[PDB]
């Protein structure tokens, strides 16, 4: 029941499938009695540097108030999944729902 | 004669026989009572080129509406499943 901040990239070739992953993450967190504080998709923004060749990955933001274990299963999903690259998770002090 | 017959609504060399409840004394493509289905002799592989409306055409033929030879062949063709 602590506040976390997730940003994850998607390989550009699976851009059409990303809201399904988003819904599946929200379904899992609501089943684990977590909630969503902000969800917004950034499109395919241009990278500063190519990673595993490529450019213009699909950026996704999320703010989650959650127990730790379901998030831990979530990073294991990010590691196992190849359609996701370059994930990053974060602690924040309180819940946040702002712009940018 | 209230009947059910065919109207070539397609183009030159590409027919589309809209099968319609029409009075027989009218023109083939003009006045009618009401559309019931369509046939396509030049249809693609995905079998959507033929459709009817079974209970409505049953209502007309129970009302006394005759049918033509081609639509008789097509009701024999759709049968119930194939």
């Amino acid at each position: 029941m602590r506040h976390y901040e997730i940003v994850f990239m998607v390989h550009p070739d699976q851009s059409e499938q990303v809201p399904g992953m988003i819904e599946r993450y929200t379904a899992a967190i609501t089943g684990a009695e977590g909630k969503i504080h902000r969800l917004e998709d950034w499109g395919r923004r241009q990278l500063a540097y190519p990673i595993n060749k490529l450019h213009k990955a699909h950026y996704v933001l999320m703010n989650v108030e959650a127990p730790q274990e379901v998030i831990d299963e979530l990073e294991t999903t990010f590691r196992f999944n190849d359609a996701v690259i370059r994930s990053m998770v974060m602690r924040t002090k309180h819940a946040v729902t702002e712009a940018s | 004669m209230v009947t059910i017959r065919l109207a070539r609504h397609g183009a030159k060399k590409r027919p589309f026989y809209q099968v319609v409840v029409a009075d027989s004394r009218n023109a083939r493509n003009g006045r009618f009572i009401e559309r019931v289905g369509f046939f396509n002799p030049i249809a693609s592989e995905k079998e959507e080129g033929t459709r009817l409306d079974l209970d409505r055409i049953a209502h007309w033929v129970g009302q006394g509406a005759t049918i033509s030879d081609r639509v008789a062949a097509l009701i024999k063709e759709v049968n119930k499943a194939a």
């Binding site: 923004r45 500063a48 190519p50 990673i51 950026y59 933001l61 370059r86 990053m88 940018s100 | -």
Partner: protein, 65 residues
């Protein structure tokens, strides 16, 4: 002077990118506080935020990628 002692900012948000474009020189290096006049309270959490944004590749490590 320090821009962040104005505006009452609680913490520098790493997803705020245009401000970091102003505080990162064209090489990609973090500027010293001795030039900007930023308070060291906010310089530390600032440079952390560039290191976060760099991980997301919103900011380049260098101009030779």
């Amino acid at each position: 002077f320090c821009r962040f002692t104005a505006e009452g900012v609680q913490e520098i948000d790493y997803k705020d990118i245009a401000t970091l474009k102003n505080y990162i020189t064209e090489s990609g290096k973090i500027v010293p506080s001795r030039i900007t006049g930023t308070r060291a309270k906010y310089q530390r959490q600032l440079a952390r935020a560039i290191k976060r944004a760099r991980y997301l590749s919103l900011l380049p490590y260098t101009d030779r990628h």
